Amino acid sequence: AAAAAAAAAAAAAAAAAAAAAAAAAA
Amino acid sequence: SMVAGSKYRGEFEERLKAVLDDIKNSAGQIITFIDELHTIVGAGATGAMDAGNMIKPMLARGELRLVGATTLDEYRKHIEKDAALERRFQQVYVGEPSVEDTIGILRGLKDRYEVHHGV
Amino acid sequence: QALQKYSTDLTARAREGKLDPVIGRDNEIRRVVQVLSRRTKNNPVLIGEPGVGKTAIVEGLAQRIVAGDVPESLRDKTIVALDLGSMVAGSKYRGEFEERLKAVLDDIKNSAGQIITFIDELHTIVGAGAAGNMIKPMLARGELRLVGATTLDEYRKHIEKDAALERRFQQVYVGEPSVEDTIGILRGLKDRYEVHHGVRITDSALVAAATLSDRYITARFLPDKAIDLVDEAASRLRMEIDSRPVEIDEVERLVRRLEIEEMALSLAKLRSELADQKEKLAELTTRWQNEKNAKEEVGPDDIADVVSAWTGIPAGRLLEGETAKLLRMEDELGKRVIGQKAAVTAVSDAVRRSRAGVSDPNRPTGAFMFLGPTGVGKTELAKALADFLFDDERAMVRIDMSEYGEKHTVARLIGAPPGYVGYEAGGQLTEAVRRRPYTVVLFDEIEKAHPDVFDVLLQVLDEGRLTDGHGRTVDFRNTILILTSNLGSGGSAEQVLAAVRATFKPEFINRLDDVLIFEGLNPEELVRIVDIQLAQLGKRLAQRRLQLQVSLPAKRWLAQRGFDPVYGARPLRRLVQQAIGDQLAKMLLAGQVHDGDTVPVNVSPDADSL
Amino acid sequence: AEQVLAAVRATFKPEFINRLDDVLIFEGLNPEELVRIVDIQLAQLGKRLAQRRLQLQVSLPAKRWLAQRGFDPVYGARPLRRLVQQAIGDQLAKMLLAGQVHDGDTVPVNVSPDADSL
Amino acid sequence: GPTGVGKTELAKALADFLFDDERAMVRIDMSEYGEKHTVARLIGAPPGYVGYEAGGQLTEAVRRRPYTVVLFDEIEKAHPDVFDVLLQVLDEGRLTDGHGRTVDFRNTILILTSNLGSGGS
Ligand SMILES: Nc1ncnc2c1ncn2[C@@H]1O[C@H](COP(=O)(O)OP(=O)(O)OP(O)(O)=S)[C@@H](O)[C@H]1O
Ligand SMILES: Nc1ncnc2c1ncn2[C@@H]1O[C@H](COP(=O)(O)OP(=O)(O)OP(O)(O)=S)[C@@H](O)[C@H]1O
Ligand SMILES: Nc1ncnc2c1ncn2[C@@H]1O[C@H](COP(=O)(O)OP(=O)(O)O)[C@@H](O)[C@H]1O
């Protein structure tokens, strides 16, 4: 008499980023 | 306002399909107008791209007319990312006017600010 | 009888002869039989990289059971293959899936020891609930037998994530076979392909299809990366056995097309090309008849024809009509670059080498740096050889290494390490050579790059491959790498070969072919240049037909002034737009030089009038 | 061995060498050694020609002429690999697609002042 | 004295006993220090120059674990611009690094070895 009615979802996964930090070469 | 309550795994998909069949079921009359269409790419996130590419086979024959208006720097972030759609659209560039045309524009809008403010 | 609705049966399909011989891999069949008759924890898992043959091991097990060469405790076990997709169908109530699964487990349990379940792709057994967890007491009593095969990464994505389930299994690692064992396999599957398509197959075809698929097609593992070549050569021969061959069809369709176009226009032109094409189609037709008056099986050339039609690379066997090209190439390339006989004689020696198949297999077909002073042609040569090979100027991959001045720019052509911002985009060099690996790659102004980019062009040479930020060794094995430079211009050969060893390391100059130092120009070989420019201009205004009747004293006069011993032929191409283009562009937008009309030029004592 | 191990110690971490096994240093090359390398390259070039069933008959003055040329003692063994195909493979590759080198019929090599004719 | 005696085997023999650690020795070699641009490798660079993330060759291995024995191999070839850096090591218990932080040498052991001699008594 009762039905289940499966549902959806939403997944998040972000991304890191790097800085390069130049060197004045002396 | 079409992803209002759609937490079940097939509601938004048939809802958009019902809207597209309602447009297609009228013999060449309705001009649709989707404002800020850069948010139509990732409309329905099914966890697997299966939304936003339902109109993709329909635009190629050109059954819905789809006027839009997106910002210039919101265009190479969402649509050029996902360039299968970018060929379906013609582009109309709009540049700002100069001072002399702004003088002509402002003299025509001096009919609506005299009513809202009685001055 | 619950298994009758939901499962299948391999054994009844094995008695009727619906399966192929699986001659090969005795060790893994013996290993599976060794595991499967154990007391407890007796459910093996075939794990291998996708392509190596894992379902065929189970089919060979079924054929061996029906044949009767099995040990004592395998007398008529009757392997039964299940379906986890059929279980979830209409089960939309609160308890229907679990009672179906319980009925299946009851019909397995009431039998004594017979039924051997075969569940292919058992990463599907993880979820399927919304349940799906009522298998652990059945597995951890030695009551279910459960042979099942997955791939490699789908194992660790699901089952290694589920470290309680993982204990009640074994792992039978199935690895790739060799090339000789591939040849041993391909003599067994030949009868089925002769039955389904009515052809004949030479053993030389089956050894060439196993040798020649090793070098060229490199994405798939090799029990079956070489089956498709035979399977498509048979289909192409079946095409040519039916009504008409191929060419004559090609030419008939082409001439019908040109006929259509021409009659619609009623252009001349095409009228000629029609007639010529009608001559050819006639000749061939007659030849056809002649032959008839006087192929019916596959051969070792047809396999290379398939691997040449697919994946771009022309790798046939000394093809007809190209001997009229490659023996004319040293002179045909001279019609666009004038002078530099040694460089063209060295470039032709890398195309006529690898076309005939003399060159080394695991090495690029030519990778060599050529340099000199400016304005000589070192860019025009690379754009001039890739015009007749490819019919277009844009099949070149021309990345510039003038922009790579600092250290971290190297990551733009290798991708990102996995976990960072641009991972969807991948590489920028590598993702364009993986598609159709036959291009010509340039490197403009190698002076300017930071000396860490040379750590990337160092395993390109002598090996041919590189990884990236996606985990795929692309192959540069049969491209052509061209490096340009501009070093020195201050001596004949000693100063520039000192400066090259001053800037580069010994371990990079060692990895190159012949470094080709150019020479410059000469005033006698300058005049031969000039008409090309004029002829090029005679093309550029071709849309209005203003073809130039140039006097020969003008061609004489353009050679005296314009010769620079330090700037090459580049001042001449500005001198032409100063002499002709200024006065012509002034006279063209005022009237009086209307299109369809011709203009001569005469030598004024300082200028040249129109 | 002094300067190169000094540069190795100046490039790594100090205990990173002791955890390793025997750090080996290689030789140079020698004119006595260079004959059998030519034997290996001729055997490889013969086995490459085994599909279209060509083979070669290399004379001993030519086999040592390949050893006299190409002895630049800073570039290792890699110039000889290029020198062989500058000598042999170019001339054979020009002849092979011009008829006259029909399969099965082998070719000998013969000495001619700086090339080698076939 | 000579080589191959115990001259560094004594050094390992007192690190593991008095400091209770097997790997608590620092063996730097002053066999490269003949110039003005070589001394600054053992103290660091300013914040912005070439060798900065690696820090000093000496000090960044003393900042953590300041319970170490420290050797100095082959002092006799060193340029005379180490001994002013090395002098206030053995005259004060402080030294400045490439960053600007402070290191304390008041609980270490310095050992300055060489190989000349060994024939004279
Ligand atoms: N020893 C063998 N004898 C005969 N044919 C073989 C042998 N090993 C593999 N094959 C063939 O190689 C092919 C491999 O097909 P499958 O084994 O079904 O692929 P697979 O290993 O199941 O890969 P997936 O990931 O499961 S699709 C089939 O055409 C088999 O007939
Ligand atoms: N020997 C030549 N044969 C034919 N065209 C030539 C020749 N030398 C120069 N040219 C022409 O002059 C131009 C040569 O420009 P490029 O060869 O591209 O310059 P470059 O060789 O790249 O030298 P740099 O140092 O890189 S600017 C082209 O327009 C060529 O058509
Ligand atoms: N008294 C000793 N106890 C242990 N090993 C010794 C002794 N004398 C010499 N040796 C040997 O010599 C080596 C130590 O040499 P080492 O002191 O490093 O020479 P160097 O003077 O060049 O530093 C050890 O490997 C050890 O086997």
Ligand 1 atom nearest the C-alpha of C227 is 29
* Residue in the structure block whose two tokens are 């994505």: C157
Instruction: Pick the residue of C348, C358, C507 with the most D CBs within 10 A to test the interface with D by mutation.
Output: C358
Place of tokens 């072919």: C513
Cα within 13 Å of Cα(C303), Cβ side:
25
- Atom number in ligand 2 closest to CA C378: 21
- Contact assessment for residue C431 and residue C306, using Cβ atoms and an 8 Å cutoff: no
Q: Which of residues 14-73 of D touch E (CB under 8 A)?
A: 14-15
Between CA C54 and CA C25 the distance in angstroms is: 11
Question: How far apart are the C-alpha atoms of C111 and B17, rounded to whole Å?
Answer: 50
Looking at ligand 1, which atom is closest to the CA of residue C50?
Answer: 25
Neighbours of chain A (3+ CB pairs under 8 A): B, C, E
CB contact under 8 A, A9 and B47: yes
Asked if residue C386 lies in contact with residue C348, where contact means CB atoms within 8 angstroms, the answer is no
* DSSP states of C429-498: SGGGTSSSS--EEEEE-TTSS-TTGGGTTTTTTTT-EE--TTS--EE-TT-EEEEE-----SSSSHHHHH
What residue type is assigned to position B5 of the chain? G
Q: DSSP letters of C201-241?
A: B-HHHHHHHHHHHHHS--SS-TTTTTHHHHHHHHHHHHHHH
Q: Which of E101, E84, E94 is nearest to E33 (CA)?
A: E84
Largest interatomic CA distance in chain C: 114
In chain C, whose CA is at the least distance from the CA of A20?
C408
C207: CATH: 3.40.50.300
Q: How many CB atoms lie within 10 A of CB C369?
A: 22
C421 touches chain A (CB under 8 A): yes
Cα separation, D95 vs C140, whole angstroms: 72
CA of C224 to the centre of ligand 1 (A): 7
Q: Residue C211 and residue C205: Cα distance in Å, rounded?
A: 10
Rounded to an integer, what distance in angstroms lies between the CA atom of residue C199 and that of residue C237? 8
Nearest chain D residue to C506, by CA: D75
By CA distance, what is B12's nearest residue in A? A8
Give the other-Cβ count within 10 Å of C139's Cβ: 19
Question: Does residue C151's CB lie within 6 angstroms of at least one atom of ligand 1?
Answer: yes
Query: Which structure tokens are listed for C477?
Result: 């094995």
Half-sphere exposure of C58 (CA within 13 A, CB side): 26
**Chain-chain contact of C506 with D89 (C-beta, under 8 angstroms):** no
d(CA E14, CA C370): 63
Of all ligands present, the nearest one to the C-alpha of E113 is 3
How buried is A11 (Cβ within 10 angstroms: 0-12 exposed, 13-18 middle, 19+ buried)?
exposed
Residue nearest (by alpha carbon) to ligand 1 atom 9: C53
C179 touches C220 (CB < 8 A): no
Give residues with Cβ within 8 angstroms of C460, minimum separation 6.
C364, C367, C466, C476, C481
Q: Hunting for tokens 């045309």 — which residue is that?
A: B101
Q: How far is CA E106 from CA C341, E92, E95, in A?
A: 76, 8, 11
Going by C-beta distance under 8 Å and a sequence separation of 6 or more, which residues neighbour residue B91? none
How are beta strands C148-150 and B67-69 bridged, if at all? Answer: unpaired
Q: How far is A2 from chain C (nearest CA, A)?
A: 6
Report the distance separating Cα C71 and Cα C33, nearest Å.
Answer: 8
% helix / strand / coil in chain D, to the nearest 5?
A: 40, 10, 45
The protein residue with its alpha carbon nearest to ligand 2, atom 4, reads: C337
SS3 C179: helix
Phi and psi, residue C202, nearest 5°: -80, 150
Question: What 3-state DSSP class applies to C601?
Answer: strand
The finding on whether E7 has its CB within 6 A of some atom of ligand 3 is yes
CA of B40 to the centre of ligand 2 (A): 49
C42: tokens are 């007796």
Question: Domain residues for C236?
Answer: 179-309
Distance set, CA C257 to CA C254, C260, C450 (Å): 5, 5, 54
Short-list C261, A24, C150, B65, CA closest to E48: A24
Question: Do E and B share at least 3 CB pairs under 8 Å?
Answer: no
Rounded distance between C-alpha atoms, residue C270 and residue C257, angstroms: 11
From the CB of C20, is ligand 1 less than 6 Å away?
A: yes
Q: How far is the CA of E8 from the centre of ligand 3 (A)?
A: 7
What is the 3-state secondary structure of C237-305? HHHHHCCCCCHHHHHHHHHHHHHHHHHHHCCCCHHHHHHHHHHHHHHHHHHHHHHHHCCCCECHHHHHH
C-beta separation of C313 from C216 below 8 A: yes
Q: List all residues 6 or more positions away from E104 whose beta carbon is below 8 Å from its beta carbon.
A: E66, E93, E94
E116 touches chain A (CB under 8 A): no
Q: Which atom of ligand 1 is nearest to the CA of C55?
A: 17
> Cα B119 from chain centroid?
38
Alpha carbons B101 and B105: distance in angstroms, whole number: 6
Candidate from C93, C130, C420 with C-beta closest to A15: C420
CA atoms within 13 A on the CB side of C317: 13
The encoded tokens of residue C72 equal: 């004592």
Asked whether the beta carbons of residue E48 and residue A23 sit closer than 8 angstroms, the reply is yes
Residue contact A6–B9, C-beta within 8 A: yes
The residue among C367, C384, C559 whose CA lies nearest residue C461 is: C367
Number of C-alpha atoms within 13 angstroms, CB side, residue C277? 19
Question: D97 near C318, Cβ under 8 Å?
Answer: yes
What are the C-alpha distances in Å from D17 to residues B16, E11, E70, E74?
Answer: 67, 19, 19, 20
Q: Is C41 left (phi over 0), alpha (psi -120 to 50) or beta?
A: left
CB contact under 8 A, E23 and D9: no
Touch criterion met for E and A (3+ Cβ pairs within 8 Å): yes
User: Rounded to whole angstroms, what are the CA distances from C222 to C49, C120, C310, C478, D90?
Assistant: 11, 21, 17, 21, 33
The string of DSSP letters for chain E reads --SSSSTTHHHHHHHHHHS--SS-EEEEE-SS--STTTGGGGT---TTSSS-SS--SSGGGTSS----EEEEE-GGG--TTSHHHHHHHTTSS-EE-SSS-EE--TT-EEEE-----SS--
End-to-end C-alpha distance for chain B, whole angstroms:
39
Is the Cβ of B5 closer than 8 Å to some Cβ of chain A?
A: no
Q: Which residues contact D95 (CB under 8 A, 6 or more apart)?
A: D101, D118
Ligand 2, residues at Cβ distance < 6 Å: C 337-339, 374-380, 486, 529, 568-570, 573
How remote is the CA of residue E15 from the centroid of ligand 2, in Å?
71
DSSP one-letter code for B41:
T
Q: Which of C327, C353, C510 sits opposite D78 (nearest CB)?
A: C510
d(CA C588, CA C583): 8
* Inter-chain CB proximity A25 and E49 less than 8 Å: yes
Q: Between the CA of residue C437 and those of C112, C139, C217, C473, D44, what are the distances in Å? A: 58, 49, 10, 13, 26
